[PDB]
């Protein structure tokens, strides 16, 4: 509807796949080459479904900060026959607050879904499902089951992936450029 939705759509149409694990269907952001991200609670194993195709997982790493605190991001390398458009230049270098973000989701249940979530706070610490978690972004939108893995963008930046909510607020794990240096 506006330039925020334009940037979000451009990311969704080229840099997402539908990922299915034993724990459900997730929006999955492809970052570069065969490297993608998903919330760590997806519990990626040795085999994942990507757009309903059985795919070997070549590597999966659940990220933690240097305090050994959960970040809720898993970086997955997929045995896929095709590379993602490289979007690393759209990743922030530092922890930050944002104005006017969009949360975008694409699954079997919620195709072509875009949500203007408004102001994004650098919230920091969250007890997420009982797990101490750092680098959390917060938005005042009542997000629901089925939006985990959704991409959070502003114009020109891909800033996080949705990992939870409390009924009134939604929470995303930060994406930082330093997670994807090769």
PDB file of C-alpha atoms in Angstrom:
ATOM      1  CA  UNK A   1       0.000   0.000   0.000  1.00  0.00           C
ATOM      2  CA  UNK A   2       3.091   2.262   0.637  1.00  0.00           C
ATOM      3  CA  UNK A   3       6.954   2.132   0.424  1.00  0.00           C
ATOM      4  CA  UNK A   4       7.248  -0.040   3.596  1.00  0.00           C
ATOM      5  CA  UNK A   5       5.031  -2.722   2.052  1.00  0.00           C
ATOM      6  CA  UNK A   6       6.997  -2.330  -1.245  1.00  0.00           C
ATOM      7  CA  UNK A   7      10.336  -3.258   0.434  1.00  0.00           C
ATOM      8  CA  UNK A   8       8.658  -6.090   2.446  1.00  0.00           C
ATOM      9  CA  UNK A   9       7.064  -7.578  -0.741  1.00  0.00           C
ATOM     10  CA  UNK A  10      10.417  -7.426  -2.592  1.00  0.00           C
ATOM     11  CA  UNK A  11      12.004  -9.512   0.213  1.00  0.00           C
ATOM     12  CA  UNK A  12       9.103 -11.991   0.423  1.00  0.00           C
ATOM     13  CA  UNK A  13       8.912 -12.612  -3.381  1.00  0.00           C
ATOM     14  CA  UNK A  14      12.618 -13.603  -3.748  1.00  0.00           C
ATOM     15  CA  UNK A  15      14.137 -14.393  -0.293  1.00  0.00           C
ATOM     16  CA  UNK A  16      11.561 -16.662   1.461  1.00  0.00           C
ATOM     17  CA  UNK A  17      10.641 -20.352   1.373  1.00  0.00           C
ATOM     18  CA  UNK A  18       8.092 -22.339   3.369  1.00  0.00           C
ATOM     19  CA  UNK A  19      10.022 -24.513   5.855  1.00  0.00           C
ATOM     20  CA  UNK A  20       8.372 -27.512   7.540  1.00  0.00           C
ATOM     21  CA  UNK A  21       9.842 -29.347  10.545  1.00  0.00           C
ATOM     22  CA  UNK A  22       8.194 -31.789  12.995  1.00  0.00           C
ATOM     23  CA  UNK A  23       7.194 -28.624  14.979  1.00  0.00           C
ATOM     24  CA  UNK A  24       5.181 -27.028  12.059  1.00  0.00           C
ATOM     25  CA  UNK A  25       5.392 -24.711   9.021  1.00  0.00           C
ATOM     26  CA  UNK A  26       7.524 -21.542   9.319  1.00  0.00           C
ATOM     27  CA  UNK A  27       8.299 -18.569   7.099  1.00  0.00           C
ATOM     28  CA  UNK A  28      12.062 -18.991   6.420  1.00  0.00           C
ATOM     29  CA  UNK A  29      14.273 -16.096   5.229  1.00  0.00           C
ATOM     30  CA  UNK A  30      17.060 -16.958   2.752  1.00  0.00           C
ATOM     31  CA  UNK A  31      20.040 -14.600   3.279  1.00  0.00           C
ATOM     32  CA  UNK A  32      22.679 -15.653   0.677  1.00  0.00           C
ATOM     33  CA  UNK A  33      23.891 -18.751  -1.236  1.00  0.00           C
ATOM     34  CA  UNK A  34      22.058 -21.736   0.440  1.00  0.00           C
ATOM     35  CA  UNK A  35      22.028 -20.104   3.925  1.00  0.00           C
ATOM     36  CA  UNK A  36      18.698 -19.316   5.614  1.00  0.00           C
ATOM     37  CA  UNK A  37      17.373 -18.547   9.139  1.00  0.00           C
ATOM     38  CA  UNK A  38      14.489 -19.897  11.230  1.00  0.00           C
ATOM     39  CA  UNK A  39      13.512 -19.596  14.929  1.00  0.00           C
ATOM     40  CA  UNK A  40      15.507 -22.089  17.058  1.00  0.00           C
ATOM     41  CA  UNK A  41      12.197 -23.510  18.496  1.00  0.00           C
ATOM     42  CA  UNK A  42      11.538 -24.975  14.954  1.00  0.00           C
ATOM     43  CA  UNK A  43      14.038 -27.743  16.084  1.00  0.00           C
ATOM     44  CA  UNK A  44      15.698 -28.212  12.675  1.00  0.00           C
ATOM     45  CA  UNK A  45      17.073 -31.757  12.188  1.00  0.00           C
ATOM     46  CA  UNK A  46      19.048 -33.571   9.462  1.00  0.00           C
ATOM     47  CA  UNK A  47      16.087 -33.311   6.961  1.00  0.00           C
ATOM     48  CA  UNK A  48      13.685 -30.365   6.459  1.00  0.00           C
ATOM     49  CA  UNK A  49      10.878 -29.735   3.898  1.00  0.00           C
ATOM     50  CA  UNK A  50      11.435 -26.593   1.732  1.00  0.00           C
ATOM     51  CA  UNK A  51       8.358 -25.677  -0.414  1.00  0.00           C
ATOM     52  CA  UNK A  52       7.199 -29.323   0.215  1.00  0.00           C
ATOM     53  CA  UNK A  53      10.513 -30.809  -1.136  1.00  0.00           C
ATOM     54  CA  UNK A  54      12.572 -33.153   1.108  1.00  0.00           C
ATOM     55  CA  UNK A  55      15.913 -31.313   1.651  1.00  0.00           C
ATOM     56  CA  UNK A  56      19.089 -32.397   3.498  1.00  0.00           C
ATOM     57  CA  UNK A  57      20.389 -29.977   6.131  1.00  0.00           C
ATOM     58  CA  UNK A  58      24.156 -29.524   5.504  1.00  0.00           C
ATOM     59  CA  UNK A  59      24.658 -27.488   8.760  1.00  0.00           C
ATOM     60  CA  UNK A  60      22.418 -25.984  11.492  1.00  0.00           C
ATOM     61  CA  UNK A  61      23.734 -23.644  14.237  1.00  0.00           C
ATOM     62  CA  UNK A  62      21.576 -22.336  17.123  1.00  0.00           C
ATOM     63  CA  UNK A  63      23.143 -18.932  17.854  1.00  0.00           C
ATOM     64  CA  UNK A  64      23.977 -17.751  21.388  1.00  0.00           C
ATOM     65  CA  UNK A  65      25.616 -14.461  22.482  1.00  0.00           C
ATOM     66  CA  UNK A  66      29.042 -14.365  24.125  1.00  0.00           C
ATOM     67  CA  UNK A  67      27.281 -14.529  27.586  1.00  0.00           C
ATOM     68  CA  UNK A  68      26.079 -18.027  26.346  1.00  0.00           C
ATOM     69  CA  UNK A  69      22.474 -16.644  26.252  1.00  0.00           C
ATOM     70  CA  UNK A  70      19.956 -17.948  23.629  1.00  0.00           C
ATOM     71  CA  UNK A  71      19.392 -15.601  20.602  1.00  0.00           C
ATOM     72  CA  UNK A  72      16.529 -17.806  19.154  1.00  0.00           C
ATOM     73  CA  UNK A  73      18.092 -17.692  15.623  1.00  0.00           C
ATOM     74  CA  UNK A  74      19.126 -20.941  13.890  1.00  0.00           C
ATOM     75  CA  UNK A  75      21.296 -20.528  10.740  1.00  0.00           C
ATOM     76  CA  UNK A  76      20.647 -23.393   8.315  1.00  0.00           C
ATOM     77  CA  UNK A  77      22.656 -24.366   5.226  1.00  0.00           C
ATOM     78  CA  UNK A  78      20.304 -26.263   2.816  1.00  0.00           C
ATOM     79  CA  UNK A  79      21.333 -28.926   0.240  1.00  0.00           C
ATOM     80  CA  UNK A  80      19.307 -26.975  -2.371  1.00  0.00           C
ATOM     81  CA  UNK A  81      20.047 -26.734  -6.113  1.00  0.00           C
ATOM     82  CA  UNK A  82      19.520 -22.943  -6.208  1.00  0.00           C
ATOM     83  CA  UNK A  83      21.033 -19.891  -4.371  1.00  0.00           C
ATOM     84  CA  UNK A  84      19.153 -17.049  -2.695  1.00  0.00           C
ATOM     85  CA  UNK A  85      19.603 -13.479  -3.842  1.00  0.00           C
ATOM     86  CA  UNK A  86      22.301 -12.057  -1.516  1.00  0.00           C
ATOM     87  CA  UNK A  87      20.492  -9.597   0.873  1.00  0.00           C
ATOM     88  CA  UNK A  88      23.272  -9.248   3.498  1.00  0.00           C
ATOM     89  CA  UNK A  89      23.721  -5.535   2.581  1.00  0.00           C
ATOM     90  CA  UNK A  90      20.145  -4.953   3.968  1.00  0.00           C
ATOM     91  CA  UNK A  91      21.110  -6.280   7.459  1.00  0.00           C
ATOM     92  CA  UNK A  92      21.827  -3.802  10.286  1.00  0.00           C
ATOM     93  CA  UNK A  93      25.325  -3.748  11.758  1.00  0.00           C
ATOM     94  CA  UNK A  94      24.237  -2.785  15.329  1.00  0.00           C
ATOM     95  CA  UNK A  95      21.403  -3.232  17.870  1.00  0.00           C
ATOM     96  CA  UNK A  96      18.866  -0.423  17.327  1.00  0.00           C
ATOM     97  CA  UNK A  97      15.274   0.834  17.633  1.00  0.00           C
ATOM     98  CA  UNK A  98      13.223   1.397  14.432  1.00  0.00           C
ATOM     99  CA  UNK A  99      10.173   3.320  13.224  1.00  0.00           C
ATOM    100  CA  UNK A 100       7.341   1.995  11.012  1.00  0.00           C
ATOM    101  CA  UNK A 101       8.169  -1.717  10.507  1.00  0.00           C
ATOM    102  CA  UNK A 102       6.246  -4.427   8.584  1.00  0.00           C
ATOM    103  CA  UNK A 103       5.989  -8.075   9.655  1.00  0.00           C
ATOM    104  CA  UNK A 104       5.562 -10.349   6.590  1.00  0.00           C
ATOM    105  CA  UNK A 105       4.493 -14.050   6.654  1.00  0.00           C
ATOM    106  CA  UNK A 106       4.079 -16.680   3.936  1.00  0.00           C
ATOM    107  CA  UNK A 107       2.794 -20.179   4.871  1.00  0.00           C
ATOM    108  CA  UNK A 108       0.027 -22.600   3.664  1.00  0.00           C
ATOM    109  CA  UNK A 109      -2.212 -21.122   6.484  1.00  0.00           C
ATOM    110  CA  UNK A 110      -1.238 -17.413   5.947  1.00  0.00           C
ATOM    111  CA  UNK A 111      -0.133 -16.713   2.328  1.00  0.00           C
ATOM    112  CA  UNK A 112       0.860 -13.162   1.315  1.00  0.00           C
ATOM    113  CA  UNK A 113       0.326 -11.713   4.824  1.00  0.00           C
ATOM    114  CA  UNK A 114       1.731  -8.245   5.663  1.00  0.00           C
ATOM    115  CA  UNK A 115       1.237  -6.453   9.060  1.00  0.00           C
ATOM    116  CA  UNK A 116       2.172  -2.787   9.785  1.00  0.00           C
ATOM    117  CA  UNK A 117       3.406  -3.247  13.382  1.00  0.00           C
ATOM    118  CA  UNK A 118       4.587   0.398  13.889  1.00  0.00           C
ATOM    119  CA  UNK A 119       7.425   1.363  16.259  1.00  0.00           C
ATOM    120  CA  UNK A 120      10.002  -1.334  17.125  1.00  0.00           C
ATOM    121  CA  UNK A 121      11.807  -1.102  20.532  1.00  0.00           C
ATOM    122  CA  UNK A 122      15.221  -2.611  21.338  1.00  0.00           C
ATOM    123  CA  UNK A 123      13.669  -4.562  24.237  1.00  0.00           C
ATOM    124  CA  UNK A 124      16.807  -6.649  24.985  1.00  0.00           C
ATOM    125  CA  UNK A 125      16.153  -9.377  27.572  1.00  0.00           C
ATOM    126  CA  UNK A 126      13.019 -11.578  27.298  1.00  0.00           C
ATOM    127  CA  UNK A 127      12.073 -14.778  29.124  1.00  0.00           C
ATOM    128  CA  UNK A 128      10.758 -16.451  25.943  1.00  0.00           C
ATOM    129  CA  UNK A 129       8.789 -19.641  26.673  1.00  0.00           C
ATOM    130  CA  UNK A 130      10.900 -20.016  29.895  1.00  0.00           C
ATOM    131  CA  UNK A 131      14.246 -19.488  28.050  1.00  0.00           C
ATOM    132  CA  UNK A 132      16.319 -16.325  28.825  1.00  0.00           C
ATOM    133  CA  UNK A 133      16.802 -14.678  25.410  1.00  0.00           C
ATOM    134  CA  UNK A 134      18.795 -11.577  24.355  1.00  0.00           C
ATOM    135  CA  UNK A 135      18.637  -9.119  21.401  1.00  0.00           C
ATOM    136  CA  UNK A 136      14.781  -9.050  21.335  1.00  0.00           C
ATOM    137  CA  UNK A 137      12.857  -6.427  19.337  1.00  0.00           C
ATOM    138  CA  UNK A 138       9.297  -5.630  20.515  1.00  0.00           C
ATOM    139  CA  UNK A 139       6.256  -4.254  18.619  1.00  0.00           C
ATOM    140  CA  UNK A 140       2.786  -3.476  20.032  1.00  0.00           C
ATOM    141  CA  UNK A 141       0.789  -5.824  17.732  1.00  0.00           C
ATOM    142  CA  UNK A 142      -1.221  -8.909  18.868  1.00  0.00           C
ATOM    143  CA  UNK A 143       0.674 -11.486  16.811  1.00  0.00           C
ATOM    144  CA  UNK A 144      -0.468 -15.150  16.819  1.00  0.00           C
ATOM    145  CA  UNK A 145       0.500 -18.781  16.206  1.00  0.00           C
ATOM    146  CA  UNK A 146       1.547 -19.235  12.557  1.00  0.00           C
ATOM    147  CA  UNK A 147       3.617 -15.962  12.327  1.00  0.00           C
ATOM    148  CA  UNK A 148       6.907 -17.399  13.758  1.00  0.00           C
ATOM    149  CA  UNK A 149       9.742 -16.903  11.259  1.00  0.00           C
ATOM    150  CA  UNK A 150       7.946 -13.876   9.771  1.00  0.00           C
ATOM    151  CA  UNK A 151      10.305 -11.229   8.437  1.00  0.00           C
ATOM    152  CA  UNK A 152      10.505  -7.797  10.118  1.00  0.00           C
ATOM    153  CA  UNK A 153      11.578  -4.988   7.744  1.00  0.00           C
ATOM    154  CA  UNK A 154      11.756  -1.230   7.478  1.00  0.00           C
ATOM    155  CA  UNK A 155      12.350   0.568   4.141  1.00  0.00           C
ATOM    156  CA  UNK A 156      15.832  -0.608   3.154  1.00  0.00           C
ATOM    157  CA  UNK A 157      16.473  -2.911   6.180  1.00  0.00           C
ATOM    158  CA  UNK A 158      15.743  -6.543   7.182  1.00  0.00           C
ATOM    159  CA  UNK A 159      15.956  -6.249  10.983  1.00  0.00           C
ATOM    160  CA  UNK A 160      14.616  -9.483  12.542  1.00  0.00           C
ATOM    161  CA  UNK A 161      12.473 -12.654  12.479  1.00  0.00           C
ATOM    162  CA  UNK A 162       9.305 -13.077  14.598  1.00  0.00           C
ATOM    163  CA  UNK A 163       9.845 -15.599  17.495  1.00  0.00           C
ATOM    164  CA  UNK A 164       6.905 -15.033  19.914  1.00  0.00           C
ATOM    165  CA  UNK A 165       4.276 -12.866  21.579  1.00  0.00           C
ATOM    166  CA  UNK A 166       2.220 -12.372  24.795  1.00  0.00           C
ATOM    167  CA  UNK A 167      -1.209 -11.658  23.213  1.00  0.00           C
ATOM    168  CA  UNK A 168      -0.693  -7.800  23.166  1.00  0.00           C
ATOM    169  CA  UNK A 169       3.010  -7.549  22.049  1.00  0.00           C
ATOM    170  CA  UNK A 170       5.070  -9.408  19.411  1.00  0.00           C
ATOM    171  CA  UNK A 171       8.775 -10.204  19.725  1.00  0.00           C
ATOM    172  CA  UNK A 172      11.456 -10.672  17.047  1.00  0.00           C
ATOM    173  CA  UNK A 173      15.114 -11.873  17.235  1.00  0.00           C
ATOM    174  CA  UNK A 174      17.534  -9.326  15.713  1.00  0.00           C
ATOM    175  CA  UNK A 175      19.365 -10.079  12.498  1.00  0.00           C
ATOM    176  CA  UNK A 176      22.874  -8.569  12.443  1.00  0.00           C
ATOM    177  CA  UNK A 177      25.284  -8.449   9.485  1.00  0.00           C
ATOM    178  CA  UNK A 178      27.984 -10.114  11.685  1.00  0.00           C
ATOM    179  CA  UNK A 179      25.945 -13.393  11.842  1.00  0.00           C
ATOM    180  CA  UNK A 180      26.526 -13.985   8.044  1.00  0.00           C
ATOM    181  CA  UNK A 181      30.216 -13.177   7.397  1.00  0.00           C
ATOM    182  CA  UNK A 182      31.488 -16.172   5.280  1.00  0.00           C
TER     183      UNK A 182
END
